[PDB]
Design a protein around this ligand. Structure first.
Ligand SMILES: [Zn+2]
Ligand SMILES: [Zn+2]
Ligand SMILES: [Zn+2]
Ligand SMILES: [Zn+2]
Ligand SMILES: [Zn+2]
Ligand SMILES: [Zn+2]
Lengths: 86, 84
DNA sequence: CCTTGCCCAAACCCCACCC
DNA sequence: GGGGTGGGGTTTGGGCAAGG
């Protein structure tokens, strides 16, 4: 029908479903390699793209061995999650 | 009627044929205005509305003369097939 | 039975926002 | 040579049964 919170007209009900997920902070699609979750499956696919591409180098973390396809992303992960021992 | 591949029981045999097309991969219904093909005639009927409706504005591709109903789809098609 | 249209989740993609 | 996420939107695949 219509957005019960913001009153936005949607031509598709699935888009209204994901919009209501954004309003309610619902993230059903959770990553299996970290704590990240998102409201859309395509978001999860794009996120898993950052955990290492097929045929590409992977920078595993020194602490929890979390895979990353970009060194800067691994550095950010270490700075954000592994500051308990600095 | 039960699927010979996954064993799903249907209350309608035509549903079994359409579902089995997913296992076999056959796509009998092929669009005449693009490369799209599907296993269900109704899906092709729905897809044909992306090329435009009678009386509505239609954006035809400048190179391959492919009609479109949504300019966003036309832009995506131009990026996909015409990088020159 | 067979058509067909609807419902919903899922795919793909573009653009804007963030750290 | 930035890399990744959130919002937004078209389109598509799978399913299902009411009514031809
Ligand atoms: Zn809303
Ligand atoms: Zn992750
Ligand atoms: Zn780590
Ligand atoms: Zn099957
Ligand atoms: Zn087509
Ligand atoms: Zn074209």
């Amino acid at each position: 029908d219509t957005c019960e919170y913001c009153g936005k007209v949607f031509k598709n009900c699935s888009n209204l479903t994901v919009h209501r997920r954004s309003h309610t902070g619902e993230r059903p699609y959770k990553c299996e390699l970290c704590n990240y979750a998102c409201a859309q499956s395509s978001k999860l696919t794009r996120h898993m793209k950052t955990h290492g591409q097929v045929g590409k180098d992977v920078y595993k973390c020194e602490i929890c061995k979390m895979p990353f396809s970009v060194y800067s992303t691994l550095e950010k992960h270490m700075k954000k999650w592994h500051s308990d021992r600095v």
